[PDB]
Design a protein around this ligand. Structure first.
Ligand SMILES: [Cl-]
Ligand SMILES: [Cl-]
Ligand SMILES: [Cl-]
Length: 281
């Protein structure tokens, strides 16, 4: 329930030429409550943004924030971001989504996909300009699986989601999607007993907990849209797929579809291995 409070530095990706600055707005809301440090990063080689960065940092410090800034560039946008996260030890990366195609506005750019694949920490991809305050926060889990790996991921998802609901004075909602009649009737009864246990463990009301049958890759966005969720918290697949496919189909589809901000968490052992990879560089 305190996963956000426990994040002590946030890497804020600052864009030089856009007309929205949602990454910094989300960071200000969060740090306003958690008092996390904010490290502002511009990823560019050409222009000297130092004066603008200093002015911005001074304004934020006067507002009471702990702030550092930097401008860097090595190789690619996502690589620059991850190198900065490593150098500053940040526990969250916040970046605004800016689609390449105006006709496919929900699809993440290929570079942002690389960021999500390799970041060894939670990544908040902002996708809406709607304020978090008073909104609806949606946590996506699979109550149908309670093995050690899923319990851990789910606990993380709920912890971050609940902490967000708290800091934003918002409400918390949960979606769980799950893919001879006598036997089916018996198996489903047992699945329901497990949902009830999950509901008691996590103190969710019937109204908060959406238990839906069908493909998670459609159910999660359906629920987000119906709730007009402003943030959706999701986990990547517990076990990586072939050829380093560590995001998984559900999260891939959901990230390219949601209109809400998306907080992307990974399994602890995945994070550990990505931490190792990010360190080699
Ligand atoms: Cl941290
Ligand atoms: Cl906000
Ligand atoms: Cl992947």
């Amino acid at each position: 329930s305190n996963a956000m409070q426990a994040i002590r530095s946030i890497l804020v990706v600052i864009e030089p030429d856009q007309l929205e600055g949602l990454a910094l707005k989300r960071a200000q809301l969060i740090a306003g409550v958690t008092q996390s440090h904010l490290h502002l990063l511009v990823c560019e080689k050409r222009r000297d943004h130092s004066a603008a960065l200093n002015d911005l940092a001074q304004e934020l410090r006067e507002e009471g924030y702990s702030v550092s800034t930097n401008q860097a560039w090595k190789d690619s946008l996502h690589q620059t971001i991850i190198a900065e996260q490593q150098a500053e030890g940040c526990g969250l990366i916040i970046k605004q989504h800016f689609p390449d195609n105006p006709l496919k506005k929900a699809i993440l750019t290929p570079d942002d996909w690389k960021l999500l694949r390799f970041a060894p920490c939670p990544v908040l991809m902002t996708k809406t300009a709607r304020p978090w305050t008073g909104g609806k926060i949606l946590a996506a889990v699979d109550v149908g699986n309670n093995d050690g790996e899923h319990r851990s991921l789910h606990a993380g998802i709920i912890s971050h989601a609940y902490d967000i609901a708290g800091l934003a004075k918002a409400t918390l909602h949960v979606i769980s999607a799950h893919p001879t009649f006598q036997l089916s009737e018996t198996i489903e009864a047992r699945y329901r007993e497990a949902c009830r246990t999950f509901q008691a463990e996590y103190g969710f009301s019937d109204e908060q907990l959406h238990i839906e049958e069908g493909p998670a890759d459609v159910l999660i966005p359906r629920t987000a849209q119906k709730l007009d969720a402003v943030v959706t918290v999701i986990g990547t697949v517990a076990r990586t797929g072939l050829s380093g496919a560590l995001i998984g189909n559900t999260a891939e589809v959901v990230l390219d579809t949601l209109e809400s901000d998306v907080l992307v968490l990974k399994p602890d052992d995945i994070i550990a291995h990505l931490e190792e990879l990010a360190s080699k560089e």
